[PDB]
Amino acid sequence: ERANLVFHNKVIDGTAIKRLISRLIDHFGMAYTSHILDQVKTLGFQQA
Amino acid sequence: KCIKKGQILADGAATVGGELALGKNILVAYMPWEGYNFEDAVLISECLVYGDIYTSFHIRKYE
Amino acid sequence: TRTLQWKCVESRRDSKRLYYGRFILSPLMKGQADTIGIAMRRALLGEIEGTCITRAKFENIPHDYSNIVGIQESVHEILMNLNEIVLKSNLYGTRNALICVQGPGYITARDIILPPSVEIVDNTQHIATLTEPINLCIGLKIERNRGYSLKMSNNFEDRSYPIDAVFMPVQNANHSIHSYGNGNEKQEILFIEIWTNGSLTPKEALHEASRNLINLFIPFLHVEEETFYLENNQHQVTLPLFPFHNKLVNLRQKKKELAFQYIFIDQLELPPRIYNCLKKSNIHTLLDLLNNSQEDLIKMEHFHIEDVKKLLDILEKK
Amino acid sequence: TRTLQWKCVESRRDSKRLYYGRFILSPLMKGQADTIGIAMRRALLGEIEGTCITRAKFENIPHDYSNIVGIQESVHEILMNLNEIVLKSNLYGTRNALICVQGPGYITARDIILPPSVEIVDNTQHIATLTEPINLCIGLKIERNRGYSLKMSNNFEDRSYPIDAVFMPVQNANHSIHSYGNGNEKQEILFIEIWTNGSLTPKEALHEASRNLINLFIPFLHVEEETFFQYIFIDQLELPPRIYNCLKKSNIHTLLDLLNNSKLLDILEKK
Amino acid sequence: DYLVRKLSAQELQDLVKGERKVPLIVDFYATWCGPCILMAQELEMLAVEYESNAMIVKVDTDDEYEFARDMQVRGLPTLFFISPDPSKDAIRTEGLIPLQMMRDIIDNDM
């Protein structure tokens, strides 16, 4: 099932990512966001 | 060799040629590497290990 | 004559234990130089075996940190000197060597009694200095291996003080990729420069890395594991046909008949259209054919309802 | 105790254009698994030959507009649909494919007239939708190149619309390393994970990547047939002022600078 | 002791023209042939297994090329099984045959 996210196109920063985590928790729950954080952590570390 | 009074004869530990030598000179890059240097973490190569670059002797006295 | 050529554009012998060689490989289609460059980079740095002293055995010293009368160097100085010498050998295994000499004088690498397998590279390397006529005999162990010796305690033997050997013979390697400027297929020029400790010339290291790389990707071209039959004990049969033959003779003696997993649809006298469709569906064995269902066969492209009927009676006769 | 053997542990086909395969290689000595995984990933992504449509000629259509009558899809969208066609082939060079069709109906990949050596992986792929009873002939250009290769020639400009086709038959590849210790027996296990678009099975891509890698390092084993005094300066040696100024103008201060560039020699050779 | 003994063509004629009490096994081998070296190892232990109950003889086809052609040796490795009784026919096996088949060829069927 396709997830109805929002295609962030401009930029993400400390405040932008913090809002996204807040919205992901309030929509998918902490179990989903805990996995999303790990994928985000790997993506951020890899591209850095 | 002729020696003047006050000149150096032998140098002890952490001293090379009459100068304080507490470390080593090594190639270093300032880049993030997959999080293994996150914050104050340091990523080193095996060259520092098998090369005995940072090998130190420690003597413990049991009395 | 070859369209893709390689050559040693520069070879240098800076010292007895520092050989430099630069090699060119041109012309390479775009993306090949990047693939070759990194694989050669990793193979040269960590996939080439070298041989060096692993442990030394003295006789009359209590420990590797004492002082020997008549020697200007401490025992720990001797071990570092031994750890620095360079040896060449194409054979594996642990081999013995001897430095049984007497002074006074300079003990160099030329004074080591080596087995025929190994050869000394730089005979002028200093080992020890003898100031008075003492008799010094040191037992050596020579081993060829990868990477570097484990820096952990292994001195449970007869006072053979271990030596932290570094087996890697390639001091450094580098590669550069330059555009050929062909403008028709984006060809590229690859340069490879290799630094070796003299145990093998850079040209030899270039070949050894290529051969070692091939031995790393050649297993994928072997047959897949558990393809041929085996007694599930040897796991390495020179002739893959024989272990299955040993099954048939035992099977014939016991008269138990071959299993369905070893009967292929080729032996079943199927119509050519039926055979081709089953092969297209990756159905090769009779057992695999039986595990399917009639509906699972109708869904195949060139398979009809009438065919599953004639297929069954062929199996019924068998 | 064991020998270096490989095996396919997972194999899924949950599409006609999406194949999955996981492969294990073991036992491997320390550091080898990373080298094999890195090189194999590079070979899989770009070194494997892929076949896809590169150019599309709209025969008998002089409209040259973004849309044509009888076809719902725009010309640009038709090219986009063509770019998604998955092909498998063994062709050498370039071939021509033709799509001449009837009036109303759906143009699919099954309707492509193919050169002898090429095949359609999924004939259900949609090309265009036909509404009005008008015939449509499309001149395709089938080519087989590697992923990493680049091509510059684009048939100049003869009403043939180029298709920016990506030549990857392996959609994705990844490798993982599992290390097992037995006190002192450090063996490594390499996992290769291959996704293909159906043009070749992941097992086949594993072999082609291995063969392409070997063909790269074969040339290094090729052999060819056989046929049968900075501390001395120009000031010290007595030189004519005319020659001295000329050398000094060219930054020839020592004798080494003189021999590196090529009755001057007669007077010099004696000293 | 007992092993595979190197014999030439004239060393094989009187063997087959004369008396044969135990079955005679002729190994047509060549030093350059890879499988023939494998074929030897099977014959090394086949001779041990059958000891004096059978005889193993190797013939080099590089030297006895004219003799191998007369024997119609179409390739290597080739084994000739000679019955001790001249009445029965011989058996020619081509290819790296397994050890088990050589057992039944010499104990029975010959």
SS (H, E, C) chain E: CCCCEECCHHHHHHHHHCCCCCCEEEEEECCCCHHHHHHHHHHHHHHHHHHHHCEEEEEECCCCHHHHHHCCCCCCCEEEEECCCCCCCCEEEECCCCHHHHHHHHHCCC
Kindly list the residues from chain B whose CB atom is less than 8 angstroms away from the CB atom of residue C50. Answer: none
Task: Give the C-alpha separation, B36 to C251, whole Å.
Answer: 59
Q: What's B3's DSSP letter?
A: -
Whether chain C has a CB inside 8 Å of the CB on E97: the answer is no
Altogether, the residues listed in chain A come to a count of 48
- Best CA proximity match to C15, nearest among C122, C108, C109: C122
Inter-chain CB pairs, C–E, below 8 Å: 9
Q: Which of E12, E24, E36, E73 is the catalytic position?
A: E36
Place of tokens 């079955």: E23
The CA distance from D147 to D165, in Å, is: 10
C-alpha span between E66 and E8 (Å, rounded): 12
Interface of C with E in 213-252 (CB under 8 A): 238-239, 242, 245-246, 249
How far apart, in whole angstroms, are the C-alpha atoms of residue E29 and residue E58?
7
Question: Which residue is associated with the tokens 């135990």?
Answer: E22
Residue C301 phi, psi (nearest 5):
-60, -65
3-state secondary structure chain C: CCCCEEEEEEEEEEECCEEEEEEEEEEEECCHHHHHHHHHHHHHHHCCCEEEEEEEECCCCCCCCCCCCCECCCHHHHHHHHHHCCEECCCCCCEEEECCEECCEEEEHHHCECCCCCEECCCCCEEEEECCCCEECCEEEEEEECCECCCCCCCCCCCEEECCCECCCEEEEEEEEEECCCCCCCEEEEEEEEEECCCCCHHHHHHHHHHHHHHHHCHHHCCCCCCCCCCCCCCCCCCCHHHHHHHHHHHHHHCCCCCHHHCECCCCCCCHHHHHHHHHCCCCEHHHHHHCCHHHHHCCCCCCHHHHHHHHHHHHHC
For residue B11, give Cα distances in angstroms to B16, C67, C71, D121. 6, 18, 20, 77
| Closest listed residue to residue D88, CA positions, set D170, D23, D14 | D170
Q: By three-state DSSP, how is residue B34 classified?
A: coil
| CB-CB neighbours of D76 under 10 Å | 10
DSSP state of A26: H
| Backbone region of residue C161 per phi and psi (left: phi > 0; alpha: psi in -120 to 50; beta: other values) | beta
Structure tokens belonging to residue C26:
């041109």
**Inter-chain residue contact C246 with E100, CB threshold 8 Å:** yes
The CA-based angle B55-B58-B61, given to 5 degrees, is 170
Single-letter amino acid, residue D84: E
E100 Cβ contact partners less than 8 Å away, ≥ 6 residues apart? C245, C246, C249
Tokens 């725009």 map to which residue? D74
CB of E96 less than 8 A from some CB of C: yes
Neighbours of chain E (3+ CB pairs under 8 A): C
Mention every residue, 6+ apart, whose C-beta is less than 8 A from residue C19: C11, C12, C13, C195, C196, C197, C198, C201, C202
Q: How many CB atoms lie within 10 A of CB D206?
A: 27
What distances in angstroms separate CA A8 from CA A5, A12, A25, D258, one per listed residue? 9, 8, 17, 67
- Would you say C35 and D47 are in contact if contact means Cβ atoms under 8 Å apart? yes
Q: What are D121's two structure tokens?
A: 């992986």
Contact C254, D70 (CB under 8 A): no
Q: What is the largest CA-CA distance in chain D?
A: 100
Extract the tokens encoding D158.
């003869």
CA distance C225 to E101: 28
A25, A28, A32, A38 alpha-carbon torsion, rounded to 10°: -50
| Residue B43 near residue B37 (C-beta atoms within 8 A) | yes
Q: Which of D21, D148, E4, B51 is nearest to C30 (CA)?
A: D148
For testing the chain B interface, which of A38, A42, A45 should be mutated: the one with the most B CBs within 10 Å?
A: A45
Beta strands E24-29 and E78-82 are antiparallel
C202-217 and D32-42 helices cross at what angle (nearest 10)? Answer: 80
Handedness of CA C225, C227, C231, C237 (dihedral sign): negative
Tokens found for residue C151: 């820096």
Nearest to E105 by CA among E81, E85, E89, E69: E81
Active site residue E36: yes
On the question of a cis peptide bond just before residue C27, with omega within 30 degrees of 0, the verdict is: yes
Given E12, E25, E26, E33, which residue is catalytic?
A: E33
Strands E55-60 and E5-6, bridge-based pairing: parallel
CA distances from C192 to C25, C46, C146, D12, E56 (A): 8, 16, 22, 41, 57
Distance from CA of C295 to the nearest CA of D (A): 19
Q: Which amino acid is at D192?
A: I
> Which residue on chain B is closest to C166 by alpha carbon?
B50
A7 lies within 8 A of chain B by CB: no
Q: Give the closest residue to C99 by CA, choosing from C142, C140, C157, C130.
A: C140
For residue D18 the two structure tokens come to 């999406």
Query: Between chains, do B46 and C148 touch, taking CB under 8 Å as contact?
Result: yes
SS3 label, residue B11: coil
Q: Taking CA E41 as the corner, what is the angle to CA E40 and CA E45, rounded to the nearest 5 degrees?
A: 115
Angle at C22 between CA C21 and CA C24, to 5 degrees: 145
Half-sphere exposure of D119 (CA within 13 A, CB side): 8
Q: What angle do CA E43, E46, E50 make, to 5 degrees?
A: 140
Report d(CA D42, CA D174) in Å as an integer: 10
Close Cβ partners of A16 (under 8 Å, ≥ 6 residues apart)? A8
The Cα–Cα gap between C23 and C206 comes to 9
Supply D174's token pair.
């990844």
Provide the 3-class DSSP secondary structure of residue B31: coil
Cα A34 to chain centroid distance, Å, stands at 10
Q: CA E9 to CA E60: how far, in whole Å?
A: 9
Query: Which residues in chain D are contacts of C6 at CB distance < 8 A?
Result: 219-220, 222
Phi-psi region of C183 (alpha: psi -120 to 50; beta: other; left: phi over 0): left
**Rama region for B35: left / alpha / beta (φ>0; ψ in -120 to 50; rest):** left
What are the phi and psi torsion angles at C227 (to 5°)?
-95, -55
**Distance in angstroms (rounded) separating the CA atoms of residues D252 and D261:** 9
Contacts B10 to C, Cβ<8 Å: none
* Closest CA relative to residue C94, chosen from C166, C145, C161, C157: C145
Decide: helix, strand or coil at residue A42. Answer: helix
Cβ contact A–B (≥3 pairs, < 8 Å): yes
Which amino acid is residue C145, in one-letter code? N
Q: After which residues is chain E broken (C to N over 2.5 A)?
A: none
Q: Is C in contact with A (3 or more beta carbon pairs below 8 Å)?
A: no
Six-digit token string for C211: 């051969």
D7 touches C225 (CB < 8 A): yes
Other C-beta atoms lying within 10 Å of the C-beta of residue C218: 14
Q: Taking the alpha carbons of D238, D242, D247, D253 in that order, is the dihedral positive or negative?
A: positive
Is residue C167 within 8 Å of residue C155, measured between CB atoms? no
Question: Measuring CA to CA, which residue among E19, E38, E22, E18 is closest to residue E30?
Answer: E38
Distance set, CA C44 to CA C48, C300, D147 (Å): 6, 51, 27
Single-letter amino acid code for the residue at D92: Y
Distance CA C79, CA B56 (A): 16
Residue B19 has what DSSP assignment?
A: E
Helix, strand or coil, per DSSP, at residue A3: coil
A19 C-beta neighbours (distance < 10 Å), count: 11
Q: Which chains touch D (3 or more CB pairs under 8 A)?
A: C
Residue pair D191/D178 in contact (Cβ under 8 Å)? The answer is yes
- Tokens (6 digits) for D49: 């030959």
Q: Which residue has the tokens 């045959």?
A: E97
Q: What dihedral angle (degrees, nearest 10) is formed by the CA atoms of A25, A26, A28, A33?
A: 0
Contact assessment for residue D195 and residue D19, using Cβ atoms and an 8 Å cutoff: yes
- Whether D52 and D97 have beta carbons less than 8 Å apart is answered as no
Resolution of the model in angstroms? 3.0
First to last CA, chain D: 73
Helices D202-217 & C202-217, crossing angle to 10 degrees? Answer: 170
Other residues' Cβ atoms within 10 Å of the Cβ of residue E11: 13
How far is residue C7's CA from residue C19's CA, in Å, rounded to a whole number? Answer: 16
Residue C109 burial class via C-beta count within 10 angstroms: exposed 0-12, middle 13-18, buried 19 and up: buried
Residue type, A31: A
**Annotated catalytic, E69?**
no
The answer to whether the bond into D27 is cis (omega within 30° of 0) is yes
- Subunits in contact with chain B (3 or more CB pairs closer than 8 Å): A, C
The answer to whether the beta carbons of residues C6 and D219 sit under 8 Å apart is yes
Q: Of the candidates C160, C161, C198, C194, which has an alpha carbon nearest to the alpha carbon of residue C175?
A: C194
Beta carbons within 8 Å of D257's beta carbon, 6+ residues apart: D251
Q: Do C246 and E98 touch (CB under 8 A)?
A: yes
Cα end-to-end distance, chain B, whole Å: 43
* DSSP code per residue over chain D: ----EEEEEEEE--SSS-EEEEEEEEEE-TTHHHHHHHHHHHIIIIIS-EEEEEEEEEET----SS--TTBSS-HHHHHHHHHT--EEE---SEEEEEEEE-SSEEEEGGG-B--TTEEES-TT-EEEEE-SS--EEEEEEEEEE-SS--------SSSEEE------SEEEEEEEEEEE-SSS--EEEEEEEEEE-SSS-HHHHHHHHHHHHHHHHSGGG--------TT-BTTTS---HHHHHHHHHTT--BHHHHHT---HHHHHHT-
User: How far, in Å, CA of A9 to CA of A16, rounded?
Assistant: 12
In the beta sheet, which residues pair with residue D180?
D187
- A16 three-state secondary structure: helix
